[PDB]
Amino acid sequence: DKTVVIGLAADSGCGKSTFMRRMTSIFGGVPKPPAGGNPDSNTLISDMTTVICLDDYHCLDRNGRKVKGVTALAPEAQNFDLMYNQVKALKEGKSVDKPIYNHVSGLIDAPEKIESPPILVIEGLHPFYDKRVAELLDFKIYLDISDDIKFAWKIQRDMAERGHSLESIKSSIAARKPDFDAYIDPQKKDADMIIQVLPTQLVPDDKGQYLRVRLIMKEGSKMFDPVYLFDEGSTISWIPCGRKLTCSFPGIKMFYGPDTWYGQEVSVLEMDGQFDKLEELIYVESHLSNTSAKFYGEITQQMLKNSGFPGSNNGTGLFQTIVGLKVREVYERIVK
Amino acid sequence: HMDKDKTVVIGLAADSGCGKSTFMRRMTSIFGGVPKPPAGGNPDSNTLISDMTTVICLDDYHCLDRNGRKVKGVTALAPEAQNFDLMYNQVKALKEGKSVDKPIYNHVSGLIDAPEKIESPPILVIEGLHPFYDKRVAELLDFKIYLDISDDIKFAWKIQRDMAERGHSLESIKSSIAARKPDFDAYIDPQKKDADMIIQVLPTQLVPDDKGQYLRVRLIMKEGSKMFDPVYLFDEGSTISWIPCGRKLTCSFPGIKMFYGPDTWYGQEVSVLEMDGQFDKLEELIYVESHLSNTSAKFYGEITQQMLKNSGFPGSNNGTGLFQTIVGLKVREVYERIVK
């Protein structure tokens, strides 16, 4: 009894559904859309978790947004009143009839009723934008992909740049970017945990194949404690190479230490590079402390359990796994 | 009951004016009891004997005295001025168990004096400029240590202890460094290529310092020896930079910075432990020692308590005292592995 509410702020086409899956996979069972409902539903339900895509609170459909000269990232194209009221209702056990934004058609279909679940996760562009809705959340997570990695991935995820031609878009970026930097990006300032994806510093990479990944964690919350190694509060650089874990061409380099995040006190855990044999992160894991793992090789076990996922060989999957375990910690800390 | 324990030979290569004494006192203090000159004998004798340790200063094997070398156009650093045949024989003659009549290079008189009898100790320590120069001597030693002070720090130390305040002399006279440097580069400094452990003392990288007051200190440990195992930090065989928390190790500026990692020492494979900077409260070094492994300590505060015992020594607040202490515990472990 009593429902826990997690917020995940992330962009489209930069790995939020993989992130989502890792976090739900810790409570076991893969969330799936309603059984008979809309085939284009954005919701996913499992025994323990229920994930809601915040697009369903667009107050204007695709064409309604087009005539007003507004993008999907604009606050005025969101219905925060309804989003607040409905998130609150699900928290207080009450069920909710919630619209569906049909990404295929571009129209706002009809609900879709939602039962209040053990953990409700809301994911999208504006989980922390509305102060009423933010105060509703027990844990705030932001996935920050830098523009260089974002805009390398799309010039490829777009179909090996099969369209539109050469490049030339590149200006699908220009349409979304200004709203992104004004409305979506500032939300990472009050996140409790941030995963930041940067270009590697080990080797030259025009493809975003090799990533520098930073897990930034707020100090001083009763809901969670930051992970560290090998000594909390210190500043460490750590090359694990070369026995213990195989590292091929671009090596591995860990960093750990205190930093400051928009005036706020944070500890940072960082990885640059790529594992090549996906055991041996237990090597890494055994030196990580405060991971909120319940048994010895849990991080390695979950990452094993999700092997085919993207980002399973670099810092993305690892730090997303750790943050999943912190989500369970927040729930257990709260329901007993 | 009958016998008998046979001798362990440690060699230390060090220039003078670099804290060879402090290094020696830290190393003999592990075994207990301050060594002392032989009561009774030559007033200028260079030996120091303890129940556990006997320390021979290899100047006592100078095959030409002070006006020798003058006549021959060489310095005390040259291989021409040493009698490596005597050195081999008496060192051979103290390890297997005999006693020797060893000359006394009187250091004030400049002359080699009448020998003093030296008996086979539990631990023999030969110390000075040429402990590893001759190959027969070096294979007689069970552990080889080299103290490597870089030119800049030597420079900056002699500039203090002499001239530029502190001492008496001129700035110009302080290029007797100009002499002597050709011999040190040529005959002394290469002996560190073969050492088992090397303590290198370099300029700091944390703060500008022209006086040699703040030190970057390196303990370079040869890999793969039956006689000892290198120290390590957090995780053996990795590469690590570590700035301790500063709430847990109180430091004014510049602070402190550790480094641990594999490296290459003259084409040989070594483990390197580094400390840069200075710590202000010696008791908190237990925070550092808490993350070292294979220190050859017996209980757990031993390095910290060994240093607190000798807390008035030079180097007690930087990497010099720390790593010198650790080498002493590794000399103890060499001796224990042999006699068992």
XYZ file of C-alpha atoms in Angstrom:
676
model
C 0.000 0.000 0.000
C 0.962 3.610 -0.875
C 2.179 4.343 -4.404
C 5.685 5.604 -5.280
C 6.157 8.124 -8.088
C 9.346 8.429 -10.165
C 9.974 11.016 -12.859
C 12.290 10.454 -15.839
C 13.113 13.459 -18.039
C 14.649 12.411 -21.353
C 14.500 13.266 -25.035
C 13.365 11.267 -28.038
C 15.901 9.184 -29.922
C 18.597 9.135 -27.234
C 17.941 5.941 -25.285
C 15.122 6.625 -22.823
C 13.226 3.380 -23.480
C 16.353 1.278 -22.860
C 16.813 3.256 -19.635
C 13.154 2.592 -18.791
C 13.567 -1.128 -19.398
C 16.630 -1.459 -17.172
C 14.810 0.250 -14.300
C 11.659 -1.871 -14.590
C 13.691 -5.054 -15.104
C 14.968 -4.777 -11.514
C 11.434 -5.448 -10.271
C 11.227 -8.263 -12.845
C 8.688 -8.776 -15.608
C 8.671 -6.586 -18.711
C 5.944 -3.883 -18.786
C 3.599 -4.204 -21.778
C 0.727 -2.163 -23.252
C -2.884 -2.670 -22.087
C -4.269 -5.995 -23.262
C -7.163 -4.998 -25.510
C -6.615 -1.254 -25.658
C -5.332 1.154 -28.286
C -2.561 -0.470 -30.370
C -0.821 2.933 -30.423
C -0.980 3.294 -26.633
C 2.122 4.736 -24.982
C 1.549 3.123 -21.571
C 3.354 0.012 -20.333
C 2.288 -2.011 -17.281
C 4.001 -4.748 -15.322
C 3.252 -6.362 -11.969
C 5.254 -3.758 -10.079
C 5.631 -0.740 -12.415
C 3.414 1.391 -14.659
C 5.073 3.751 -17.155
C 3.229 6.758 -18.614
C 4.472 8.766 -21.589
C 3.917 12.457 -20.870
C 2.944 13.119 -24.508
C -0.566 11.991 -23.500
C -0.903 15.439 -21.878
C -0.369 17.397 -25.081
C -3.247 19.885 -25.078
C -2.901 20.260 -28.868
C -2.629 17.563 -31.515
C -0.107 17.640 -34.368
C -2.218 19.964 -36.520
C -3.395 22.049 -33.572
C 0.267 22.538 -32.705
C 1.028 23.418 -36.334
C -1.494 26.267 -36.649
C -0.327 27.917 -33.417
C 3.309 27.836 -34.553
C 4.326 25.815 -31.487
C 6.387 22.644 -31.128
C 5.792 19.637 -28.881
C 8.508 20.959 -26.556
C 6.683 24.203 -25.742
C 5.057 24.427 -22.280
C 1.900 26.011 -23.720
C 1.361 22.820 -25.753
C 1.095 20.848 -22.484
C -1.883 20.486 -20.137
C -0.146 20.571 -16.761
C -3.419 20.991 -14.840
C -4.665 17.605 -16.021
C -1.203 16.059 -15.679
C -0.985 17.259 -12.062
C -4.502 16.165 -11.114
C -4.066 12.730 -12.698
C -0.644 11.989 -11.200
C -1.970 13.015 -7.778
C -5.026 10.790 -8.234
C -2.930 7.738 -9.118
C -0.782 8.404 -6.041
C -3.850 8.411 -3.760
C -4.892 4.976 -5.060
C -7.572 6.515 -7.265
C -7.761 5.304 -10.846
C -7.671 7.661 -13.821
C -8.997 7.898 -17.387
C -6.067 9.288 -19.354
C -5.891 10.396 -23.019
C -3.545 8.930 -25.621
C -1.378 10.928 -28.000
C -1.248 8.799 -31.161
C 2.254 9.410 -32.520
C 1.297 7.605 -35.739
C -1.829 9.609 -36.578
C -0.997 12.767 -34.636
C -4.426 12.882 -32.953
C -5.485 12.741 -29.300
C -7.373 9.459 -29.010
C -9.681 8.635 -26.097
C -8.598 6.932 -22.841
C -7.324 4.311 -21.617
C -8.081 3.940 -17.912
C -5.130 3.634 -15.517
C -5.183 1.833 -12.163
C -2.972 3.121 -9.345
C 0.122 0.889 -9.238
C 2.896 0.111 -6.732
C 5.367 2.340 -8.608
C 4.236 4.836 -11.243
C 6.916 6.277 -13.521
C 6.179 9.329 -15.662
C 8.587 9.810 -18.561
C 8.822 12.555 -21.149
C 9.861 16.124 -21.817
C 8.190 17.908 -18.904
C 8.127 15.813 -15.678
C 9.840 18.544 -13.609
C 8.573 21.644 -15.416
C 5.435 22.198 -13.299
C 6.107 22.902 -9.620
C 2.893 21.152 -8.555
C 3.803 17.988 -10.473
C 7.464 18.076 -9.426
C 6.528 18.227 -5.742
C 4.491 15.078 -6.489
C 7.580 13.035 -7.392
C 9.595 10.964 -4.920
C 12.626 10.744 -7.238
C 13.690 12.830 -10.251
C 15.923 11.383 -12.991
C 17.290 13.238 -16.031
C 19.057 11.723 -19.046
C 21.314 14.374 -20.604
C 22.798 13.637 -24.026
C 25.043 16.419 -25.236
C 24.304 17.998 -28.603
C 27.402 16.483 -30.236
C 26.304 12.938 -29.360
C 22.602 13.600 -29.964
C 23.270 15.126 -33.372
C 25.718 12.413 -34.372
C 23.240 9.659 -33.474
C 20.399 11.161 -35.522
C 22.698 11.465 -38.548
C 22.652 7.634 -38.579
C 19.523 6.573 -36.695
C 17.957 8.407 -39.532
C 18.405 5.321 -41.601
C 22.196 5.696 -42.114
C 21.240 9.201 -43.175
C 18.805 7.884 -45.825
C 16.790 11.048 -45.418
C 16.133 13.623 -46.129
C 18.930 13.306 -48.707
C 22.207 15.073 -47.846
C 22.237 15.905 -45.051
C 20.222 18.128 -44.875
C 18.324 17.891 -41.628
C 20.307 19.172 -39.555
C 17.286 21.492 -39.366
C 14.889 19.106 -37.706
C 17.489 19.922 -35.094
C 17.025 23.673 -35.609
C 13.263 23.410 -35.075
C 13.434 21.429 -31.823
C 16.667 22.835 -30.378
C 15.622 26.344 -29.202
C 12.622 25.021 -27.284
C 14.825 22.215 -25.953
C 17.484 24.520 -24.533
C 14.942 26.870 -22.932
C 12.376 24.416 -21.537
C 13.742 20.844 -21.375
C 17.420 21.317 -20.525
C 16.909 23.519 -17.398
C 14.986 20.628 -15.814
C 18.233 18.772 -15.063
C 19.193 21.343 -12.421
C 16.892 19.900 -9.734
C 17.196 16.245 -10.729
C 18.338 14.000 -7.900
C 20.361 11.887 -10.358
C 21.675 12.821 -13.816
C 23.208 10.551 -16.439
C 25.262 12.707 -18.814
C 26.598 11.344 -22.113
C 29.602 13.174 -23.565
C 32.066 12.528 -26.407
C 34.943 10.291 -25.389
C 38.308 11.795 -24.534
C 40.251 8.586 -25.235
C 40.079 8.539 -29.051
C 38.627 10.517 -31.957
C 35.031 9.538 -32.667
C 32.701 11.141 -35.215
C 30.059 8.444 -34.672
C 29.254 8.569 -30.964
C 30.402 4.960 -30.717
C 32.668 5.717 -27.738
C 31.134 7.577 -24.811
C 32.229 9.454 -21.723
C 29.372 8.827 -19.271
C 28.874 10.793 -16.047
C 26.535 9.852 -13.201
C 25.931 13.023 -11.181
C 24.269 12.483 -7.810
C 22.913 15.029 -5.337
C 24.350 14.859 -1.825
C 21.993 15.144 1.122
C 18.759 13.302 0.309
C 16.948 11.029 2.754
C 15.726 9.008 -0.249
C 19.074 7.756 -1.569
C 22.817 7.806 -1.062
C 25.467 8.316 -3.762
C 27.616 5.484 -5.060
C 31.381 5.857 -4.598
C 34.824 4.216 -4.822
C 37.180 3.479 -3.184
C 36.810 6.209 -0.578
C 33.837 8.565 -0.265
C 34.561 12.267 -0.630
C 37.946 11.779 -2.309
C 38.997 12.534 -5.881
C 40.112 9.444 -7.817
C 41.111 8.566 -11.363
C 41.172 4.832 -12.071
C 42.368 2.851 -15.092
C 41.400 -0.788 -14.351
C 43.543 -2.144 -17.252
C 44.710 -4.592 -18.211
C 44.308 -7.859 -16.362
C 41.064 -8.335 -14.391
C 38.972 -6.908 -17.304
C 39.761 -7.024 -20.996
C 39.907 -3.599 -22.608
C 40.642 -3.475 -26.318
C 41.461 -0.455 -28.464
C 39.940 2.474 -26.520
C 40.753 1.669 -22.914
C 38.672 2.246 -19.767
C 39.105 5.184 -17.378
C 36.981 5.786 -14.291
C 36.803 9.057 -12.396
C 35.178 9.780 -9.052
C 34.885 12.796 -6.830
C 33.021 15.819 -5.550
C 31.801 18.445 -7.998
C 29.209 21.224 -8.176
C 26.082 21.169 -10.343
C 24.372 24.542 -10.819
C 25.461 25.618 -7.361
C 24.485 22.303 -5.766
C 26.680 19.763 -4.003
C 27.112 16.567 -6.038
C 29.397 13.544 -6.226
C 30.271 12.410 -9.756
C 31.005 8.885 -10.985
C 32.310 8.830 -14.543
C 33.308 6.249 -17.150
C 35.089 6.669 -20.484
C 35.528 3.747 -22.849
C 34.100 0.305 -23.512
C 34.289 -3.145 -21.957
C 34.908 -6.082 -24.294
C 34.172 -9.118 -22.046
C 30.911 -8.708 -20.130
C 31.730 -10.503 -17.091
C 34.479 -8.753 -15.059
C 32.332 -5.690 -14.372
C 32.027 -7.451 -11.023
C 35.675 -6.378 -10.840
C 34.450 -2.796 -11.267
C 31.373 -3.610 -9.170
C 33.363 -5.056 -6.263
C 35.234 -1.748 -5.994
C 32.042 0.287 -6.278
C 30.382 0.860 -2.906
C 26.912 2.071 -1.869
C 25.516 0.657 -5.130
C 22.262 -0.317 -3.320
C 22.679 -3.820 -4.712
C 21.048 -6.484 -2.568
C 23.490 -9.311 -3.371
C 27.028 -9.619 -4.636
C 26.947 -9.624 -8.430
C 23.549 -7.996 -8.877
C 24.775 -5.251 -11.224
C 26.610 -7.871 -13.269
C 23.557 -10.146 -13.031
C 21.100 -7.498 -14.238
C 23.471 -6.363 -16.990
C 23.882 -10.042 -17.875
C 20.080 -10.428 -17.727
C 19.795 -7.547 -20.249
C 22.821 -8.371 -22.386
C 21.485 -7.510 -25.844
C 20.482 -4.013 -24.724
C 22.233 -1.017 -26.291
C 24.878 0.624 -24.156
C 25.592 -2.698 -22.443
C 29.346 -2.358 -23.094
C 29.933 1.203 -21.849
C 28.976 3.493 -18.982
C 25.376 3.990 -20.122
C 24.074 0.540 -19.232
C 26.128 0.324 -16.037
C 25.078 3.666 -14.568
C 21.493 3.068 -15.695
C 21.565 -0.257 -13.846
C 22.898 1.396 -10.682
C 20.237 4.101 -10.855
C 17.594 1.398 -11.244
C 18.713 -0.128 -7.955
C 18.455 3.317 -6.350
C 14.839 3.478 -7.556
C 14.036 0.252 -5.709
C 15.819 1.691 -2.669
C 13.566 4.764 -2.749
C 10.471 2.550 -2.904
C 11.564 0.226 -0.083
C 12.612 3.226 2.053
C 9.098 4.616 1.668
C 6.644 1.682 1.977
C 7.904 0.389 5.346
C 70.411 -25.748 22.352
C 72.574 -25.150 19.272
C 72.812 -23.108 16.151
C 73.102 -21.067 13.817
C 71.294 -18.195 12.038
C 73.377 -16.858 9.145
C 73.703 -13.347 7.869
C 71.400 -11.188 5.729
C 73.137 -8.479 3.680
C 71.365 -5.238 2.734
C 73.006 -2.641 0.498
C 72.112 1.043 0.290
C 73.394 3.351 -2.445
C 73.120 7.023 -1.535
C 74.901 10.295 -2.119
C 75.947 12.197 0.966
C 73.909 15.205 2.017
C 70.634 13.516 1.010
C 69.404 11.981 4.260
C 71.177 8.629 4.064
C 71.359 8.882 7.864
C 67.621 9.471 8.314
C 66.999 6.573 5.927
C 69.373 4.440 7.997
C 67.823 5.449 11.329
C 64.331 4.702 10.009
C 65.536 1.306 8.783
C 67.372 0.317 11.975
C 64.517 1.560 14.170
C 62.289 -1.204 12.781
C 64.533 -3.735 14.520
C 64.857 -1.636 17.674
C 67.757 0.003 19.447
C 69.817 2.877 18.054
C 73.077 1.585 16.542
C 76.200 3.180 17.966
C 79.892 3.521 17.090
C 82.048 0.667 18.413
C 82.801 1.622 22.002
C 86.531 1.941 22.585
C 88.035 1.959 19.104
C 89.151 4.551 16.564
C 87.465 7.903 17.351
C 86.688 8.398 13.644
C 85.458 4.847 12.952
C 82.613 4.746 10.433
C 80.777 1.684 11.776
C 77.512 1.571 13.737
C 76.597 -1.647 15.557
C 73.305 -2.747 17.119
C 72.254 -6.134 18.487
C 70.400 -6.616 15.182
C 72.246 -4.413 12.660
C 75.834 -3.627 11.688
C 76.297 -0.687 9.309
C 79.544 -0.377 7.331
C 80.230 2.853 5.443
C 81.914 1.783 2.210
C 84.322 4.736 2.305
C 86.337 2.326 4.484
C 87.210 0.550 1.202
C 88.740 3.624 -0.457
C 91.808 2.150 -2.148
C 93.398 5.635 -2.214
C 93.161 8.261 0.538
C 92.698 12.022 0.148
C 96.073 12.984 -1.327
C 95.660 9.969 -3.435
C 92.947 10.905 -5.937
C 94.572 14.348 -5.806
C 97.762 12.870 -7.263
C 95.755 10.614 -9.594
C 93.305 13.227 -10.889
C 90.087 11.525 -9.734
C 87.435 11.957 -7.046
C 86.069 9.706 -4.327
C 83.300 8.818 -6.801
C 85.625 7.162 -9.318
C 85.868 3.356 -9.462
C 89.656 3.831 -9.470
C 89.607 4.987 -5.828
C 87.852 1.882 -4.440
C 89.217 -1.575 -3.583
C 86.423 -3.820 -4.834
C 88.589 -6.903 -4.217
C 88.709 -6.206 -0.479
C 85.033 -5.208 -0.561
C 84.104 -8.558 -2.119
C 86.265 -10.576 0.265
C 85.241 -9.002 3.580
C 81.590 -8.824 2.524
C 81.872 -12.450 1.437
C 83.679 -13.013 4.750
C 80.882 -11.548 6.884
C 77.945 -13.331 5.202
C 79.171 -16.926 5.550
C 80.040 -16.201 9.194
C 83.647 -15.066 9.721
C 84.965 -11.799 11.146
C 87.097 -9.247 9.302
C 89.698 -6.560 9.988
C 88.261 -3.699 8.011
C 90.153 -0.437 7.379
C 88.928 2.917 8.639
C 88.773 5.783 6.176
C 89.231 8.563 8.694
C 86.882 11.237 7.385
C 88.506 14.196 9.152
C 92.114 13.166 8.504
C 91.648 12.076 4.890
C 93.734 8.943 5.485
C 92.993 5.232 5.704
C 93.644 4.043 9.254
C 94.356 0.825 11.131
C 91.592 -1.779 10.722
C 88.918 -2.545 13.290
C 87.623 -6.073 13.713
C 84.052 -6.610 12.524
C 82.057 -9.728 13.404
C 79.274 -11.465 11.482
C 76.045 -9.731 12.540
C 72.469 -10.962 12.138
C 71.910 -8.257 9.509
C 74.745 -6.656 7.550
C 74.159 -3.269 5.908
C 76.759 -1.879 3.489
C 76.108 1.736 2.624
C 77.664 4.414 0.461
C 78.428 5.249 -3.133
C 79.448 1.894 -4.682
C 77.411 -0.929 -3.073
C 76.257 -2.244 -6.468
C 79.095 -1.125 -8.759
C 81.007 -4.422 -8.702
C 79.022 -7.429 -9.887
C 80.406 -9.943 -7.377
C 79.359 -7.748 -4.432
C 75.857 -7.126 -5.791
C 75.017 -10.825 -6.138
C 76.110 -11.259 -2.501
C 73.408 -8.811 -1.368
C 69.922 -10.022 -0.456
C 68.272 -6.611 -0.996
C 69.418 -3.547 -2.944
C 68.150 -0.031 -2.210
C 68.921 3.206 -4.051
C 68.212 6.760 -2.867
C 67.797 8.933 -5.975
C 67.630 12.682 -5.359
C 67.153 14.523 -8.639
C 69.583 17.277 -9.606
C 67.051 20.077 -9.055
C 66.392 18.958 -5.483
C 70.075 18.307 -4.763
C 70.867 21.744 -6.277
C 68.153 23.402 -4.161
C 69.275 21.540 -1.019
C 72.980 22.402 -1.269
C 71.977 25.986 -2.095
C 70.301 26.095 1.273
C 72.622 24.089 3.548
C 75.415 26.119 1.939
C 74.990 29.760 0.868
C 71.677 31.541 0.069
C 71.190 31.899 3.834
C 71.332 28.753 6.031
C 75.008 27.933 5.401
C 78.053 30.127 5.099
C 79.504 29.855 1.582
C 79.046 31.891 -1.625
C 76.791 31.229 -4.607
C 79.848 30.919 -6.853
C 81.520 28.295 -4.652
C 78.316 26.307 -5.091
C 79.546 24.932 -8.336
C 81.696 22.376 -6.713
C 78.451 20.870 -8.004
C 80.046 21.461 -11.421
C 82.899 19.227 -10.434
C 81.695 15.939 -8.933
C 78.638 15.952 -11.226
C 80.499 14.164 -14.074
C 81.453 11.342 -11.695
C 78.010 11.032 -10.088
C 76.301 10.841 -13.478
C 78.904 8.388 -14.725
C 79.600 5.950 -11.889
C 77.041 6.373 -9.082
C 73.734 7.087 -10.813
C 73.677 3.967 -13.079
C 73.725 1.738 -9.973
C 69.999 2.427 -9.533
C 69.142 0.471 -12.698
C 69.627 -2.794 -10.759
C 68.208 -1.798 -7.364
C 65.361 -3.790 -5.846
C 63.674 -0.631 -4.519
C 64.354 2.998 -5.456
C 63.183 6.138 -3.664
C 63.219 9.023 -6.143
C 62.766 12.569 -4.816
C 61.565 15.023 -7.452
C 60.228 18.583 -7.604
C 56.598 18.927 -6.563
C 53.956 19.537 -9.223
C 51.315 21.055 -6.899
C 52.843 24.434 -5.990
C 55.827 26.507 -7.198
C 58.781 25.756 -4.944
C 62.415 26.618 -5.678
C 63.753 25.493 -2.279
C 63.002 21.762 -2.370
C 60.553 22.139 0.515
C 57.675 20.301 -1.205
C 58.467 16.926 -2.711
C 57.176 14.488 -5.296
C 58.458 11.159 -3.950
C 58.444 7.886 -5.900
C 58.871 4.361 -4.523
C 59.792 2.257 -7.566
C 59.537 -1.473 -6.809
C 60.899 -4.173 -9.125
C 58.254 -6.762 -9.980
C 58.584 -10.495 -9.465
C 60.897 -11.329 -6.565
C 60.793 -14.234 -4.129
C 62.245 -11.899 -1.499
C 59.522 -9.216 -1.426
C 56.231 -8.032 -2.905
C 55.545 -4.416 -3.944
C 53.098 -2.229 -2.027
C 49.889 -1.161 -3.730
C 46.953 1.221 -3.448
C 43.275 0.197 -3.559
C 43.654 -2.340 -6.376
C 46.831 -4.134 -7.400
C 48.102 -3.557 -10.928
C 45.781 -0.683 -11.814
C 46.685 2.954 -12.472
C 45.272 5.391 -9.915
C 45.449 9.064 -9.016
C 44.073 9.765 -5.535
C 43.635 13.089 -3.744
C 42.647 12.166 -0.157
C 39.494 13.747 1.146
C 40.987 16.632 3.140
C 38.378 16.266 5.823
C 39.982 12.868 6.491
C 43.583 14.085 6.012
C 44.138 17.655 7.183
C 46.412 19.572 4.817
C 47.090 23.214 4.236
C 48.085 23.988 0.676
C 49.316 22.374 -1.540
C 47.520 19.304 -0.221
C 48.466 15.734 -1.075
C 48.270 13.556 -4.179
C 48.988 9.833 -4.486
C 49.764 7.876 -7.642
C 49.944 4.114 -8.107
C 50.694 2.286 -11.326
C 52.749 -0.056 -13.473
C 55.772 1.424 -15.222
C 59.150 0.631 -16.800
C 62.477 1.157 -14.999
C 65.313 0.962 -17.542
C 63.488 -1.651 -19.571
C 62.465 -3.467 -16.387
C 58.953 -3.950 -15.025
C 58.146 -2.015 -11.846
C 55.317 -0.930 -9.569
C 55.349 2.780 -8.694
C 53.819 4.324 -5.578
C 53.937 8.123 -5.479
C 53.215 10.867 -2.986
C 53.242 14.570 -3.861
C 52.753 17.226 -1.204
C 52.810 17.435 2.568
C 50.456 16.332 5.350
C 50.186 18.440 8.500
C 49.053 15.981 11.228
C 51.134 12.797 11.307
C 48.552 10.666 13.148
C 46.032 10.850 10.302
C 48.447 9.020 7.965
C 46.535 5.943 9.166
C 43.905 7.128 6.669
C 46.495 6.692 3.903
C 48.002 3.489 5.327
C 44.437 2.128 5.486
C 44.446 1.957 1.667
C 47.945 0.550 1.146
C 48.319 -3.204 0.815
C 51.382 -5.445 1.062
C 53.135 -2.924 3.298
C 54.888 -5.875 5.012
C 53.440 -4.526 8.260
C 52.578 -6.931 11.070
C 49.766 -5.219 12.943
C 47.890 -2.358 11.274
C 49.151 1.014 12.496
C 52.758 -0.048 12.124
C 53.921 2.429 9.470
C 52.039 5.247 11.198
C 53.313 4.141 14.611
C 56.851 3.544 13.313
C 56.797 7.117 12.010
C 55.203 8.513 15.173
C 58.027 6.853 17.112
C 60.489 8.739 14.890
C 58.205 11.768 14.545
C 61.040 14.274 14.919
C 62.964 13.005 11.909
C 63.328 14.997 8.694
C 60.827 13.819 6.116
C 58.160 12.870 8.662
C 55.544 14.988 6.848
C 55.983 13.924 3.208
C 56.548 10.871 1.027
C 60.194 10.551 2.087
C 59.515 9.365 5.634
C 56.544 7.265 4.536
C 58.267 5.292 1.789
C 61.524 4.991 3.732
C 59.538 3.452 6.591
C 57.874 1.029 4.174
C 61.235 -0.054 2.756
C 62.313 -0.817 6.324
C 59.366 -3.163 6.784
C 60.331 -4.787 3.470
C 63.914 -5.218 4.704
C 62.470 -6.958 7.767
C 60.430 -9.257 5.515
C 63.489 -10.080 3.393
C 65.351 -11.066 6.558
C 62.442 -13.141 7.872
C 61.973 -14.983 4.571
C 65.641 -16.009 4.619
C 66.101 -17.153 8.217
C 62.467 -18.244 8.779
